[PDB]
UniProtKB/TrEMBL annotation, chains A, C, F:
GO terms for biological process: regulation of DNA-templated transcription. Keywords: DNA-binding, Transcription, Transcription regulation. The keyword DNA-binding applies. Pfam families: TetR_C_33, TetR_N. One of its GO terms (molecular function) is transcription cis-regulatory region binding. Residues 32-51 bind DNA. It comes from the Bacteria. PROSITE patterns: HTH_TETR_2. The keyword Transmembrane does not apply. Signal peptide: none annotated. It comes from Pseudomonas aeruginosa (strain ATCC 15692 / DSM 22644 / CIP 104116 / JCM 14847 / LMG 12228 / 1C / PRS 101 / PAO1). This is Probable transcriptional regulator.
Length: 201, 198, 201, 198, 198, 201
DNA sequence: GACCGTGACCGAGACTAATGTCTCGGTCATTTTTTTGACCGAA
DNA sequence: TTCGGTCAAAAAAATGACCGAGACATTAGTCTCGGTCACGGTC
DNA sequence: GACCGTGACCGAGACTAATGTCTCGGTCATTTTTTTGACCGAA
DNA sequence: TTCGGTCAAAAAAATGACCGAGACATTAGTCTCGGTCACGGTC
């Protein structure tokens, strides 16, 4: 058979790049979803033939956020042994931070609104499921003892606070510019991931 | 007149203190705010002199209690507790910052009193330097990393700025807040400050 | 709480609380109006537009003392335990022996001389009410069987006698300094005044 | 001879006693004294010095009967009898109590005749001595709770002061003038101050 | 539509490349190529009907790669390394070159679409003239032998064709079908040509 | 010397040389044996003496090839100088392309049929011995240092490609019309052939 | 006691008349494959 | 005044398929191969 | 050799006529002390 | 929506201040204190 498997795959890859080049600061509350259709490599048209104003594999682009997560989970690296997972998770999370800003536009218009319920309620469902899957690793970590033997939502909520703090940090009017020209913050990210909710004799 | 006014002013202090810890919502002007202690319209003016300048004086008296809790008079054993008690102050009664978020996004008319706001910003930087100076003391301890410690400032600042949204914006803490083992873990962080490596 | 609540209540309350310890120093002809006003932190026009002359002040003070003794009488409920009630009575009456001896002096000074007939009559009638209240307490004491079974005015007079003699004990030149601040013998007197009338089978 | 002078002195003393009980102490100079006695003016001064000597000799004879009272003769000396007799002698005749209370600050503490004053203080101390001796005699077999003796002293002090001042009240003495059952009540509960379970 | 067109064209080219490399040219036709294509025989027909549309397309693309190879970007271009890349571009995948010569001597005789062949010889002359100017450039500095350029043109074509015949001779093909050492040996000999004997 | 021996020798020689030219003209398949006989013009009974048939053609042509290689092996000079023999061999291999073409035709119809591929194995053994002598005098000159330290078969295949390139170029219907009257092109080819594979100081 | 080189005759790989079968898909037709722009609602 | 999420479709995109030309491969009369008995010369 | 108890006389702490000086601020007046509700603009 | 930041003021709030009553404290004639020479009785 022909690379029609590969052709739909590379549609999703060109769209991994297309939605990206839009959404480096665009979202949906910042760009009209049908005009996001207009805004891309293919016309608005094939974004309603292949898609429905980004939809048919933008639901999947958000699931591909959730999959760069759910495939980190089953990390293709043979190790997938310990904290290297949640570390790379945080690293993934804290990039093109308009990241939580884009999901904040989604929070404005579609998420708890469920304007695409086909996107966001399924997202809520199975991101809670996959949340409990990373939390299942972190149950393997509570088995490791490297992390505390307290509930796992303890450690999760600490991580959510820490990550949202990273995001909102790079939004502070002038209490971020001291940092914004500093990438010793990235060794600090290494130290965050290695040694938060962690062990210390 | 002398201790008359002192009792008056500490009454003012504790009044706004409790009232901004827990008393405020979508609020008509200080005919609701300072009428929380049943006063009137110009009773606000014997008192506070503001139909709606308490829609910043909430923040200003808050910032004054801030100014006070920036005590550099800790006895011994430098804790970073300028930082940690500031974080405590903010997050303890997390509904304190819920009410800050609320009343702010109710009343916030972009840029209130420039004069007060910028003197605030001034001394905020100054007490940021006092905070950073307790960090300088633990740099005298060699206990915190010798960096430009606006690093440390910002890091724990955001550690709590996210505690606010994890407690406010419905996500997962509000699902498992019923069990305040998580606030007990905030407390554990409160007590497990900078433990040496055994 | 509002405006003139504040002005009225603050002025009069601290006026009273100044004149109290002023009299505990010296007395009531020794201490006088201008002393009291100047000792507050304010002046005598607060006074002279609240109370002009000393008799009004004394009557205010004494019916305030009587309202304090009323709150003392108000033993709420629960069988109205009278042991600790008599205890509090003797303490409230004996503490600051300068205070009770001052009111005894003021009886002969302003009351027996009867400066202000109106508030004097008010005190007479409410004293009838308070004598009735203490009589009621004594009646329920005798009903309980603690006290000796006799009329109640017996024990009314006996309690007044013990209180007066005990404040005199903290006013004599002989054993005042031995007992004016000895909490041990103060409580001893309170026990003797609370363990009175008891049955002896 | 000796008995004639003795009875003359006793007549002068009781005459002046009734006078000072009736009239007073300051305006009652020797005028009323020798007007009532009348045996002879110089013949009255054959026996006494003035009003002041008569005051202090009355107090002397009072304390003489008191010293006659204090005694510990019985083998089975159950001290309830001496205790009740002391309570009676203290509380009986409240007019005598008011009298000597006036005479004290009139002539004693002024001490126009100080030898009798120091003898009064002497016999005060001696009555105190026998009282404490009696208290420890009671405590000997365990017949009281363990408290100081001066506790009981000042307790009886307040008791008798209350009694005399109550029967000298402005109004309630009008009610108690005919109440000897109240006196029996006073005696019973004055015998029953501060006791422990057997 | 458009990018769909790119898809079909590129797939058809690579498919026919593989098939022809294995089986020569009379064997391979529209249908082996359509099957390996998978997206059709009309995919072949409606784009490429005959068998030599493919050959002309292929060899003109090959010579366009040869022209991009002969870069005029570097004015002081390393002509020796460019000649190395030329020899490698033409010699690599030798069975590709034997396929090229097979189709060459086929359609030089048949010439299904002669106008494409007129264009081909014209554009070949154009590339050869650029090559010729570059031979003049590398003769001027004194690396090649000072003779007419087309001498070196025919010499390079002969050397590549002979190396291909070597990479299909039944004796030394297996000795040198993948001798990268001998491949670079051939390249350096063809590139160090015309150098004056020191 | 041998009157009759030389007679028969030159008879075979001239007959099969006439044949060589006949098949440079027409070919070896269409032309049969007594065609060669009537071409030469001797008693064809004498023609059939030679070997048997077209086998005569193939056989003695490979024999002439063998005798050329026999002359090519070794010459006479002090140290048996290398450049002269090398250049002469380069020339002769790059000489007379149609001769080599018809020899390829003979090779093809020798191994296609099964008359005598033994002469083909003889060609390969004389090839091997000539290559061995090539390596031998190459190393004789490298005694003082002549060619770089690469294999000898490297230079073998280099000269192979060179000779085939020359022959195929002068066979190419496009450029042969230009270079057919260019012996300067042959001189250039020889300069290329002698200046390859040599070491550099 | 031996042998070179050509005048007298006739039968078969191929050539030249007479025949026969391929090459893949070309020109067709079929289903079909990413590929606009409107076409409606939320905040 | 900020955007939020939906259907029919070309031009040819993906499966075949009668009927196409001019060219190998034999095979009879011969081409032109493929042969000799018999007749001339020398130690 | 000694001494108890009362008829004959006259001079002074206080009482009773005659006078004289306090108590603090009371009823006044002064300045005065936290104490509404409108009265305007921002975003 | 959705709030943001300003002046005159009572009722008496804070300083005095003539003119207030009925009560200690002496002091002359005496109250009534304060005294005796001189005259009666016993070992």
């Amino acid at each position: 058979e022909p690379r029609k498997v590969r052709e739909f795959r590379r549609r999703e890859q060109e769209i991994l790049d297309t939605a990206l080049k839009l959404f480096l600061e665009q979202g949906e509350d910042s760009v009209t979803v049908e005009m996001i259709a207009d805004a891309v490599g293919i016309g608005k048209g094939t974004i309603y033939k292949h898609f429905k104003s980004k939809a048919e594999i933008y639901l999947r682009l958000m699931l591909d956020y959730e999959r760069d997560l759910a495939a980190l989970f089953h990390s293709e690296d043979v190790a997938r042994d310990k904290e290297a997972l949640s570390r790379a998770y945080f690293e993934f999370r804290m990039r093109d931070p308009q990241r939580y800003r884009l999901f904040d536009r989604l929070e404005e218009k579609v998420v708890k609104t469920s304007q695409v319920p086909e996107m966001v309620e399924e997202l809520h469902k199975i991101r809670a499921s996959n949340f409990e899957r990373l939390t299942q690793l972190i149950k393997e970590r509570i088995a490791d003892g490297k992390l505390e033997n307290v509930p796992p939502y303890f450690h999760y909520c600490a991580a959510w606070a820490l990550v949202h703090g990273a995001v909102a940090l790079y939004h502070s009017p002038f209490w971020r510019e001291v940092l914004e020209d500093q990438e010793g913050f990235f060794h600090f990210l290494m130290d965050i991931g290695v040694r938060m909710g962690n062990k210390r004799k």
